[PDB]
């Protein structure tokens, strides 16, 4: 007894810390930069949609104005 405390504690004392650091690094890398880039891309597409909407609205208002 009291000799399995080492073999159940020291293991996770380093392996768990290193593995969780690895998980945090990979998750941040996968998540943050890709999300910001994708949001910028969607913003550019949204601006293009806004331009198309403005053009169509203006041309239809020009024709229909009677």
């Amino acid at each position: 007894d009291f000799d399995d405390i080492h073999r159940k504690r020291m293991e996770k004392d380093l392996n768990e810390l290193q593995a969780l650091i690895e998980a945090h690094f990979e998750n941040r890398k996968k998540e943050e930069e890709e999300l910001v880039s994708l949001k910028d891309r969607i913003e550019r597409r949204r601006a293009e949609r806004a331009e198309q909407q403005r053009i169509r609205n203006e041309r239809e208002k020009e024709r229909q104005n009677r």
Partner: peptide, 10 residues
């Protein structure tokens, strides 16, 4: 993630 890189200390 910077904090996790510090935690890489473990």
């Amino acid at each position: 993630d910077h904090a996790l890189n510090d935690m890489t200390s473990i």
